[PDB]
Amino acid sequence: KWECPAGYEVKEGLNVDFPHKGMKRAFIVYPAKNVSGPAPVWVPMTGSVESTNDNLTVARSGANSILADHGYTVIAPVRACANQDPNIRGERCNGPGSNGWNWNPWFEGRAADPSGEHWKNDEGPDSSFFVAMVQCVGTKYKLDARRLFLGGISSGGTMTNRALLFRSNFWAGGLPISGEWYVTSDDGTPLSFDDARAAVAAAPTKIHQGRVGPYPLPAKVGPLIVMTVWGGEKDLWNCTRPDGSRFLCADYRPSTQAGSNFFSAQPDVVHVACSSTHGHMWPQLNTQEFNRWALDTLASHPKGSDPRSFKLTQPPEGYTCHVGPFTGLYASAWS
């Protein structure tokens, strides 16, 4: 299952012109340190505005590349809209998607109009690119097939949710940090930002369909561990209109709740709901302790492990986590 497009030579560092579905893609590889044998894999994804390079090396953005020093082979995809440039920030990426896609940074959700119909049933080019990427790197570095994890922030977090829903038989788990769910009605009807938000508030513990994934969502997914993170009361995102003004267009309380609801109900999935107070950005409090804790937590549940034997350890100061759905975002019915 390890293979590269014929003639592709994978290398440490930046890899460009990787052929996938008629596209030329790029990604950066940081081989694990202090490891004998197959290494667990971390696939970090930036959001709408930070570059992949920022995500990988700027402290306040997560400095994800450092996990290679923590013993993970890090394989970082560059967003399609960045045209293979790991330094592109919001240029041509931070805005509405095209061709049926809701948001441009990653092919992470179907658009609200009929042009998104097709993606109800098709993973999209990022989800499949990520699998081929990891399969290709593994012909050159020893990767632990039971510990392929991906994760990201904001749009990268929405892409993580999507990837998990369409490829739950590949990834061992993931870390969607303030990712959307794009809640829709049970019949798949896209809902406005306001209605999507009201729909979860009216039924905070139910399973909500969403444009982030297959429609209808899958009845059963492969074995996984998923850790969804909510950045508290200010974890919200305001879009920027062409005239440069801003308006609220995403609230992560309902989307983190909705994902925790779907994943917690799955029998072969361990779901950890984590809350912090840093807002909408990469976890800011004790950032590296958090990255280390989060990934080693994911790694403690190799693919196919029994959810009953999972044991959560305490997170760094500034984080509240527990197994199961979020319970602190909305009042319980028992009032």
Domain locations in the chain as residue ranges: 1-335
Q: Is 174 exposed, middle or buried (0-12, 13-18, 19+ CB in 10 A)?
A: buried
21 and 9 Cβ atoms separated by less than 8 Å: no
CA dist 283 → 35, 113, 152, 309 (Å): 27, 33, 11, 28
Q: What is the resolution of this structure in A?
A: 2.1
Strand partners, 19: 24
**Which one is catalytic: 154, 255, 264, 305?**
154
254: left (phi over 0), alpha (psi -120 to 50) or beta: alpha
* Torsion 41-74-123-261 (CA) sign: positive
Angle at 288 between CA 282 and CA 289, to 5 degrees: 115
Query: What is the β-pairing status of strands 269-275 and 224-230?
Result: parallel
What tokens were used for 75? 């394989």
Method: X-ray
Nearest Cα to Cα of residue 147 among 289, 302, 27? 302
**228-246 burial code (b ≥16 CB/10 A, e <16):** bbbbbeebbbebeeeeeee
What tokens were used for 225? 């561990």
Active site residue 48: no
> Strand ranges (DSSP E) for 130-255?
143-153, 173-177, 224-230, 236-240, 246-251
How far is residue 307's CA from residue 269's CA, in Å, rounded to a whole number? 7
Rg (CA), the chain: 18
Matching CATH number, 1-335, of 3.40.50.1820, 1.10.3720.10, 3.40.50.720, 3.30.70.100: 3.40.50.1820
**Which one is catalytic: 61, 65, 260, 264?**
260
How far is residue 78's CA from residue 225's CA, in Å, rounded to a whole number? 24
How far is residue 11's CA from residue 122's CA, in Å, rounded to a whole number? 30
First to last CA, the chain: 51
Beta-carbon contacts of residue 68 (< 8 Å; ≥ 6 apart): 30, 31, 32, 33, 74
Q: Is 289 helix (H, G, I), strand (E, B) or coil?
A: helix
How far is residue 137's CA from residue 9's CA, in Å, rounded to a whole number? 9
CA dist 158 → 23, 197, 311, 318, 333 (Å): 22, 16, 26, 23, 28
**160-172 burial code (b ≥16 CB/10 A, e <16):** bbbbbbbbbebbb
**177-211 burial code (b ≥16 CB/10 A, e <16):** bbbbbbbbeeeeebbebeebbebbeeebbebbbbb
Active site residue 154: yes
How far is residue 130's CA from residue 92's CA, in Å, rounded to a whole number? 21
> Strand ranges (DSSP E) for the chain?
13-20, 23-30, 39-45, 73-77, 143-153, 173-177, 224-230, 236-240, 246-251, 269-275, 320-323
